[PDB]
Design an enzyme around this catalytic site. Structure first.
Site, PDB file in Angstrom:
ATOM      1  N   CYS A 217      -5.572   1.328   5.742  1.00 20.42           N
ATOM      2  CA  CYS A 217      -7.019   1.344   5.843  1.00 20.42           C
ATOM      3  C   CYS A 217      -7.380   0.562   7.102  1.00 20.42           C
ATOM      4  O   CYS A 217      -6.937   0.941   8.187  1.00 20.42           O
ATOM      5  CB  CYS A 217      -7.682   0.745   4.585  1.00 20.42           C
ATOM      6  SG  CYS A 217      -7.136  -0.901   4.022  1.00 20.42           S
ATOM      7  N   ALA A 219      -7.665  -3.376   7.192  1.00 15.40           N
ATOM      8  CA  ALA A 219      -6.816  -4.562   7.144  1.00 15.40           C
ATOM      9  C   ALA A 219      -5.454  -4.100   6.709  1.00 15.40           C
ATOM     10  O   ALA A 219      -4.450  -4.781   6.910  1.00 15.40           O
ATOM     11  CB  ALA A 219      -7.350  -5.573   6.138  1.00 15.40           C
TER      12      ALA A 219
END
Length: 280
Positions: A217, A219
């Site tokens: 995604c 992070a």
């Protein structure tokens, strides 16, 4: 063979309840000594801090996926991404942070070296106005992108309900491998859009197309942790879903042992839970 988490959920209802189930996850090198239960030195290393998007999110060393392809001398072994286990092995899933304009090469390098086939991006370049990721795939219309000796060509794309299925012909050496990017754009942010019909539809779809699964995604641990765990259960279910006290907690417990905060939100916690739920 009918464990009833079902006849045990009717009372596991809300905040403090789910907050306390989420507070117990103080899996922050705790116990009796917050001493590097799992150091993060190659991430903190000199010429590597920049290969990291978020600071706080430091990939563990014992699970850090290193790189071996060396397209050019300059190549670094480090990539902010860890190997999360699955129902049988230790290289089932790979969670990385969103690629970086700098880490684009490394990203592919990995994909190539670790023979990945199914990529899962659970973001949108920009979300809430700010940029959350770096493009690495080549869109239709155009033709060929190029991340070093790596050439990414889109053969086509399925613009489905809440995600698009990408097919990307990637040619490194004189060899060209095919890859599928499941771009899951839908998803408010990190609170409660509790209607994971598509998060399941997606996962199903991915299991429709063994070699590691690159889930990522922004992070590379918030929303990626939540997929892993749902699929992970998804896996137990359709075979032998080992009934040990094995619960969503103990589950995310092992998950955030491979990568710090693989599920850092209570809402996301309640989320992986409710989806696990729908899977009745």
């Amino acid at each position: 063979l009918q464990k009833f988490l079902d006849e045990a959920q009717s009372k596991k209802i809300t905040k403090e309840e789910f907050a306390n189930e989420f507070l117990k996850l103080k899996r922050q090198s705790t116990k009796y000594k917050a001493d590097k239960t799992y150091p993060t030195t190659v991430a903190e290393k000199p010429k590597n801090i920049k290969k990291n998007r978020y600071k706080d999110i430091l990939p563990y060393d014992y699970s850090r996926v290193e790189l071996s392809l060396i397209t050019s001398d300059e190549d670094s072994s480090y990539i902010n991404a860890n190997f999360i286990k699955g129902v049988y092995g230790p290289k089932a899933y790979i969670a990385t942070q969103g690629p970086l304009s700098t880490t684009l090469l490394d990203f592919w390098r990995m994909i190539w070296e670790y023979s990945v086939l199914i990529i899962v991006m659970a973001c949108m370049e920009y979300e809430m106005g700010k940029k959350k990721c770096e493009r690495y795939w080549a869109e239709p219309g155009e033709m060929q992108l190029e991340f070093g000796p790596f050439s990414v060509s889109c053969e086509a794309e399925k613009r489905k309900s809440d995600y698009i299925i990408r097919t990307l012909k990637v040619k490194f050496n004189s060899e060209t491998r095919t890859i599928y990017q499941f771009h899951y754009k839908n998803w408010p942010d990190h609170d409660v859009p509790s209607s994971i019909d598509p998060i399941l539809e997606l996962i199903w779809d991915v299991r429709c197309y063994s070699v590691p699964i690159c889930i990522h995604c922004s992070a590379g641990c918030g929303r990626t942790g939540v997929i892993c765990a749902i699929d992970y259960t998804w896996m137990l279910l359709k075979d032998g879903i080992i009934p040990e006290n094995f619960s969503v907690f103990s589950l995310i417990r092992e998950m955030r042992t491979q990568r710090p905060s693989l599920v850092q939100t209570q809402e996301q916690y309640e989320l992986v839970y409710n989806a696990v739920l729908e899977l009745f």
